[PDB]
mmCIF file of C-alpha atoms in Angstrom:
data_model
loop_
_atom_site.group_PDB
_atom_site.id
_atom_site.type_symbol
_atom_site.label_atom_id
_atom_site.label_comp_id
_atom_site.label_asym_id
_atom_site.label_seq_id
_atom_site.Cartn_x
_atom_site.Cartn_y
_atom_site.Cartn_z
ATOM 1 C CA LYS M 1 0.094 0.069 -0.098
ATOM 2 C CA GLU M 2 1.480 3.588 -0.977
ATOM 3 C CA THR M 3 1.504 4.891 2.626
ATOM 4 C CA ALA M 4 -0.447 8.608 3.301
ATOM 5 C CA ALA M 5 2.920 10.141 3.826
ATOM 6 C CA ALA M 6 4.551 9.005 0.475
ATOM 7 C CA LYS M 7 1.145 10.164 -1.368
ATOM 8 C CA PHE M 8 1.466 13.839 0.071
ATOM 9 C CA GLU M 9 5.196 13.831 -1.142
ATOM 10 C CA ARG M 10 3.859 12.317 -4.584
ATOM 11 C CA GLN M 11 1.004 15.046 -4.880
ATOM 12 C CA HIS M 12 2.674 18.120 -3.119
ATOM 13 C CA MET M 13 6.668 17.845 -2.701
ATOM 14 C CA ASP M 14 8.721 19.219 -5.430
ATOM 15 C CA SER M 15 11.806 20.647 -3.600
ATOM 16 C CA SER M 16 14.229 22.283 -6.009
ATOM 17 C CA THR M 17 16.755 19.495 -7.230
ATOM 18 C CA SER M 18 5.186 29.361 -17.160
ATOM 19 C CA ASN M 19 4.985 25.797 -18.316
ATOM 20 C CA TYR M 20 5.805 24.619 -14.772
ATOM 21 C CA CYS M 21 2.362 22.850 -14.027
ATOM 22 C CA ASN M 22 1.544 21.267 -17.128
ATOM 23 C CA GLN M 23 5.122 19.341 -16.674
ATOM 24 C CA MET M 24 4.564 18.520 -12.870
ATOM 25 C CA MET M 25 0.546 17.316 -12.838
ATOM 26 C CA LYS M 26 1.210 14.427 -15.204
ATOM 27 C CA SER M 27 4.395 13.249 -13.834
ATOM 28 C CA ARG M 28 2.678 12.441 -10.028
ATOM 29 C CA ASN M 29 -0.246 10.581 -11.522
ATOM 30 C CA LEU M 30 -2.536 13.873 -11.040
ATOM 31 C CA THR M 31 -3.771 13.669 -14.688
ATOM 32 C CA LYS M 32 -3.436 10.288 -15.284
ATOM 33 C CA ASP M 33 -7.100 9.058 -14.548
ATOM 34 C CA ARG M 34 -8.571 12.725 -14.385
ATOM 35 C CA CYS M 35 -7.697 16.330 -14.426
ATOM 36 C CA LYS M 36 -7.350 17.092 -10.749
ATOM 37 C CA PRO M 37 -8.806 20.726 -10.630
ATOM 38 C CA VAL M 38 -6.234 22.527 -8.277
ATOM 39 C CA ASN M 39 -2.781 21.121 -6.743
ATOM 40 C CA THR M 40 -0.328 23.041 -4.779
ATOM 41 C CA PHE M 41 3.640 22.134 -5.031
ATOM 42 C CA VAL M 42 5.698 23.163 -2.165
ATOM 43 C CA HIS M 43 9.338 24.157 -3.082
ATOM 44 C CA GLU M 44 11.164 24.151 0.523
ATOM 45 C CA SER M 45 12.917 21.053 1.865
ATOM 46 C CA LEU M 46 11.031 17.940 3.018
ATOM 47 C CA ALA M 47 12.303 18.863 6.654
ATOM 48 C CA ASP M 48 10.831 22.460 6.695
ATOM 49 C CA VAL M 49 7.353 21.325 5.568
ATOM 50 C CA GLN M 50 7.547 18.141 8.035
ATOM 51 C CA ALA M 51 8.246 20.511 10.429
ATOM 52 C CA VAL M 52 4.896 22.611 9.986
ATOM 53 C CA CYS M 53 3.502 19.660 11.948
ATOM 54 C CA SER M 54 4.777 21.000 15.153
ATOM 55 C CA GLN M 55 3.977 24.778 14.455
ATOM 56 C CA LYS M 56 0.494 26.504 15.024
ATOM 57 C CA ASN M 57 -2.580 24.195 15.374
ATOM 58 C CA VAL M 58 -5.475 25.340 13.309
ATOM 59 C CA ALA M 59 -8.718 24.096 12.200
ATOM 60 C CA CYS M 60 -8.669 22.547 8.682
ATOM 61 C CA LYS M 61 -11.078 24.016 5.921
ATOM 62 C CA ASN M 62 -13.487 21.420 6.731
ATOM 63 C CA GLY M 63 -13.583 21.528 10.526
ATOM 64 C CA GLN M 64 -10.907 18.885 11.154
ATOM 65 C CA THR M 65 -8.745 20.397 13.883
ATOM 66 C CA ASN M 66 -5.342 18.389 13.054
ATOM 67 C CA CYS M 67 -3.901 20.986 10.636
ATOM 68 C CA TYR M 68 -0.786 22.906 11.414
ATOM 69 C CA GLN M 69 -0.036 26.479 9.705
ATOM 70 C CA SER M 70 3.661 27.275 8.891
ATOM 71 C CA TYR M 71 5.028 30.229 10.841
ATOM 72 C CA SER M 72 6.843 31.690 7.692
ATOM 73 C CA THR M 73 5.350 31.999 4.263
ATOM 74 C CA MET M 74 6.878 29.216 1.866
ATOM 75 C CA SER M 75 7.596 29.145 -2.063
ATOM 76 C CA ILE M 76 4.767 27.317 -3.594
ATOM 77 C CA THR M 77 3.206 26.812 -7.057
ATOM 78 C CA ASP M 78 -0.733 26.777 -7.681
ATOM 79 C CA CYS M 79 -1.652 24.434 -10.469
ATOM 80 C CA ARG M 80 -5.421 25.317 -11.681
ATOM 81 C CA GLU M 81 -7.012 23.948 -14.684
ATOM 82 C CA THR M 82 -7.718 26.444 -17.637
ATOM 83 C CA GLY M 83 -10.487 26.319 -19.570
ATOM 84 C CA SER M 84 -9.119 24.609 -22.301
ATOM 85 C CA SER M 85 -8.327 21.613 -20.103
ATOM 86 C CA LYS M 86 -10.184 18.617 -20.794
ATOM 87 C CA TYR M 87 -9.442 15.119 -19.798
ATOM 88 C CA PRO M 88 -7.075 13.396 -21.079
ATOM 89 C CA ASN M 89 -5.525 16.934 -22.601
ATOM 90 C CA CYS M 90 -5.029 18.397 -19.162
ATOM 91 C CA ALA M 91 -3.993 21.681 -19.163
ATOM 92 C CA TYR M 92 -2.845 24.285 -16.158
ATOM 93 C CA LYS M 93 -2.330 27.781 -15.477
ATOM 94 C CA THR M 94 0.726 28.524 -13.214
ATOM 95 C CA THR M 95 0.952 31.133 -10.432
ATOM 96 C CA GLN M 96 4.035 31.087 -8.249
ATOM 97 C CA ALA M 97 3.455 32.523 -4.796
ATOM 98 C CA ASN M 98 4.789 33.000 -1.097
ATOM 99 C CA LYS M 99 2.206 32.039 1.468
ATOM 100 C CA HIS M 100 2.024 30.354 4.541
ATOM 101 C CA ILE M 101 0.775 26.782 4.121
ATOM 102 C CA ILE M 102 -1.760 24.744 6.114
ATOM 103 C CA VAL M 103 -1.375 20.859 6.297
ATOM 104 C CA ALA M 104 -3.203 18.160 8.007
ATOM 105 C CA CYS M 105 -0.914 15.670 10.076
ATOM 106 C CA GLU M 106 -0.708 12.193 11.092
ATOM 107 C CA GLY M 107 1.200 9.298 12.166
ATOM 108 C CA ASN M 108 4.646 8.705 14.099
ATOM 109 C CA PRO M 109 6.551 10.496 12.888
ATOM 110 C CA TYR M 110 3.795 12.883 12.815
ATOM 111 C CA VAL M 111 4.302 14.283 9.308
ATOM 112 C CA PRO M 112 1.824 15.909 6.535
ATOM 113 C CA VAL M 113 -0.793 13.868 5.035
ATOM 114 C CA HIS M 114 -2.731 16.229 3.451
ATOM 115 C CA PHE M 115 -2.274 19.653 1.963
ATOM 116 C CA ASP M 116 -5.278 21.876 3.007
ATOM 117 C CA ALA M 117 -4.780 25.588 2.028
ATOM 118 C CA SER M 118 -2.288 28.428 1.446
ATOM 119 C CA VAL M 119 -2.863 32.120 3.010
ATOM 120 C CA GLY G 1 11.593 24.817 27.418
ATOM 121 C CA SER G 2 12.273 24.243 23.684
ATOM 122 C CA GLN G 3 10.449 20.921 23.990
ATOM 123 C CA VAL G 4 6.779 20.148 24.313
ATOM 124 C CA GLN G 5 6.107 17.947 27.205
ATOM 125 C CA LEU G 6 2.466 16.414 28.188
ATOM 126 C CA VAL G 7 2.991 15.999 32.145
ATOM 127 C CA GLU G 8 0.338 13.472 33.110
ATOM 128 C CA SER G 9 -0.592 13.186 37.037
ATOM 129 C CA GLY G 10 -2.945 10.794 39.048
ATOM 130 C CA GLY G 11 -3.456 7.149 38.088
ATOM 131 C CA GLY G 12 -2.244 4.481 39.749
ATOM 132 C CA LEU G 13 -3.593 1.203 41.787
ATOM 133 C CA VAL G 14 -7.300 1.119 42.642
ATOM 134 C CA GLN G 15 -9.961 -1.399 43.468
ATOM 135 C CA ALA G 16 -12.647 -2.602 41.157
ATOM 136 C CA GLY G 17 -15.541 -0.095 41.968
ATOM 137 C CA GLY G 18 -13.272 2.594 42.749
ATOM 138 C CA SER G 19 -12.488 6.226 41.508
ATOM 139 C CA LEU G 20 -9.422 7.939 40.174
ATOM 140 C CA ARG G 21 -8.524 11.077 38.483
ATOM 141 C CA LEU G 22 -6.225 11.545 35.729
ATOM 142 C CA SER G 23 -4.783 14.901 35.106
ATOM 143 C CA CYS G 24 -2.678 16.300 32.144
ATOM 144 C CA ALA G 25 -1.007 19.732 31.446
ATOM 145 C CA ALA G 26 1.029 20.697 28.218
ATOM 146 C CA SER G 27 4.260 22.852 28.510
ATOM 147 C CA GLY G 28 6.249 24.232 25.740
ATOM 148 C CA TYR G 29 3.693 24.827 23.330
ATOM 149 C CA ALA G 30 2.757 28.486 22.686
ATOM 150 C CA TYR G 31 -0.762 28.348 21.358
ATOM 151 C CA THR G 32 -3.952 26.263 22.396
ATOM 152 C CA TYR G 33 -4.233 22.659 21.217
ATOM 153 C CA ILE G 34 -7.878 22.534 19.758
ATOM 154 C CA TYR G 35 -8.395 18.910 20.672
ATOM 155 C CA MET G 36 -6.891 16.808 23.758
ATOM 156 C CA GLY G 37 -7.710 13.525 24.703
ATOM 157 C CA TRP G 38 -6.923 10.449 26.721
ATOM 158 C CA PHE G 39 -6.062 7.121 24.982
ATOM 159 C CA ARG G 40 -4.986 4.026 26.740
ATOM 160 C CA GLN G 41 -3.666 0.511 25.838
ATOM 161 C CA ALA G 42 -5.120 -2.435 28.045
ATOM 162 C CA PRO G 43 -3.107 -5.587 28.032
ATOM 163 C CA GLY G 44 -4.153 -7.831 24.948
ATOM 164 C CA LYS G 45 -5.403 -4.793 23.113
ATOM 165 C CA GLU G 46 -4.598 -2.370 20.896
ATOM 166 C CA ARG G 47 -4.496 1.381 21.885
ATOM 167 C CA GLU G 48 -7.912 3.053 21.808
ATOM 168 C CA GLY G 49 -9.493 6.478 22.397
ATOM 169 C CA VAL G 50 -11.013 6.900 25.750
ATOM 170 C CA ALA G 51 -12.064 10.573 25.672
ATOM 171 C CA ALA G 52 -11.493 13.673 24.083
ATOM 172 C CA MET G 53 -12.466 17.253 24.185
ATOM 173 C CA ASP G 54 -12.108 20.563 22.232
ATOM 174 C CA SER G 55 -10.671 23.906 23.997
ATOM 175 C CA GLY G 56 -14.011 25.522 24.328
ATOM 176 C CA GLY G 57 -15.631 22.678 26.321
ATOM 177 C CA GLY G 58 -17.264 20.821 23.644
ATOM 178 C CA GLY G 59 -16.762 18.096 20.801
ATOM 179 C CA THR G 60 -17.032 15.696 23.813
ATOM 180 C CA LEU G 61 -16.556 12.020 22.794
ATOM 181 C CA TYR G 62 -16.284 8.978 24.691
ATOM 182 C CA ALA G 63 -15.332 5.231 23.842
ATOM 183 C CA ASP G 64 -18.646 3.595 24.372
ATOM 184 C CA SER G 65 -17.432 1.145 26.925
ATOM 185 C CA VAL G 66 -16.723 3.889 29.544
ATOM 186 C CA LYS G 67 -19.572 6.361 28.699
ATOM 187 C CA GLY G 68 -21.359 7.071 31.890
ATOM 188 C CA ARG G 69 -18.498 6.037 34.220
ATOM 189 C CA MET G 70 -15.821 8.334 32.898
ATOM 190 C CA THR G 71 -15.786 12.296 32.652
ATOM 191 C CA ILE G 72 -13.415 14.431 30.472
ATOM 192 C CA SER G 73 -12.993 18.204 31.269
ATOM 193 C CA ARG G 74 -10.617 21.198 30.055
ATOM 194 C CA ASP G 75 -11.844 23.818 31.916
ATOM 195 C CA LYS G 76 -8.990 24.239 34.375
ATOM 196 C CA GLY G 77 -6.473 26.017 32.039
ATOM 197 C CA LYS G 78 -4.691 26.304 28.874
ATOM 198 C CA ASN G 79 -3.775 23.247 27.317
ATOM 199 C CA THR G 80 -4.899 20.909 30.120
ATOM 200 C CA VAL G 81 -7.413 17.883 30.066
ATOM 201 C CA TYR G 82 -8.273 15.831 33.456
ATOM 202 C CA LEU G 83 -10.410 12.571 33.313
ATOM 203 C CA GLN G 84 -12.506 11.461 36.055
ATOM 204 C CA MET G 85 -13.110 7.745 36.210
ATOM 205 C CA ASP G 86 -15.775 6.123 38.546
ATOM 206 C CA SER G 87 -17.114 2.538 39.261
ATOM 207 C CA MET G 88 -13.989 1.367 37.810
ATOM 208 C CA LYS G 89 -13.630 -2.074 36.122
ATOM 209 C CA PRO G 90 -10.946 -4.748 35.575
ATOM 210 C CA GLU G 91 -11.193 -3.793 31.884
ATOM 211 C CA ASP G 92 -9.843 -0.351 32.695
ATOM 212 C CA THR G 93 -6.618 -1.398 33.559
ATOM 213 C CA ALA G 94 -4.221 0.008 31.039
ATOM 214 C CA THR G 95 -1.724 2.578 30.315
ATOM 215 C CA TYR G 96 -3.436 5.676 29.900
ATOM 216 C CA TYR G 97 -2.057 8.460 27.614
ATOM 217 C CA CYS G 98 -2.675 12.081 27.133
ATOM 218 C CA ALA G 99 -2.703 13.292 23.728
ATOM 219 C CA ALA G 100 -2.817 16.950 22.046
ATOM 220 C CA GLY G 101 -3.419 18.403 18.768
ATOM 221 C CA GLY G 102 -5.383 15.934 16.838
ATOM 222 C CA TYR G 103 -9.118 15.386 16.055
ATOM 223 C CA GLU G 104 -11.828 13.699 18.291
ATOM 224 C CA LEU G 105 -10.935 10.095 19.007
ATOM 225 C CA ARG G 106 -8.626 9.387 15.921
ATOM 226 C CA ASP G 107 -5.305 8.312 17.445
ATOM 227 C CA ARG G 108 -3.461 8.962 14.123
ATOM 228 C CA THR G 109 -4.308 12.652 14.225
ATOM 229 C CA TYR G 110 -2.433 13.383 17.550
ATOM 230 C CA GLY G 111 0.938 14.485 17.272
ATOM 231 C CA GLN G 112 1.890 14.970 20.914
ATOM 232 C CA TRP G 113 1.654 12.237 23.464
ATOM 233 C CA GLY G 114 2.340 11.845 27.183
ATOM 234 C CA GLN G 115 4.856 9.289 28.550
ATOM 235 C CA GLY G 116 1.963 6.981 29.816
ATOM 236 C CA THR G 117 0.410 6.402 33.243
ATOM 237 C CA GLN G 118 -0.140 3.003 34.604
ATOM 238 C CA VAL G 119 -3.913 2.402 36.000
ATOM 239 C CA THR G 120 -4.282 -0.995 37.502
ATOM 240 C CA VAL G 121 -7.841 -1.946 38.735
ATOM 241 C CA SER G 122 -7.332 -4.656 41.103
ATOM 242 C CA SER G 123 -9.942 -7.569 40.731
#
């Protein structure tokens, strides 16, 4: 079974190693079965994002209470389907931003399993 | 203190039919944990959620097996949680753990855990 922690890294972690989002949404099996309407990639280290689980406890958008907000803003890419996007030809607008991230955390080690929001 | 600690007190040895109070206070965390709760692991069993409550005194949930004998409260301070246990049963013998920062009785969602307090209910 893919673990929940591995799925968060596959969906949202692209630590550095206009067309950014079209390249990245296919690679991660996020355009493989359907066009995921919105996805955010985080360009900070896995350690800095995992650290958010020890930062400010906040309510998730849905009302779950195991979410955590990063104290600093972080470098992120929002990928959003464009009007011409239609599976299986998915297509995305890229908007780079610097925002606090909010993640839901689970497990031991206690790590992100869900990307909830950026603000 | 750079580290967060969930300090547990109370618990220990009691007769079947008796009463005990567990208390937990977090130190080292600068904000308010929205949910805190008590979990336990009894001999022969997996860890299970016993009781949980949110920082406004609501969202209260209990394991069905302890409902009506145990009472959780938080109203005595920031990041504190207490468990009053009455009419105790042999099946309540367990290591009890304070936990903070999760949601309801879902133990995977809690990221801070006390070291564990033994509670032994003598037959």
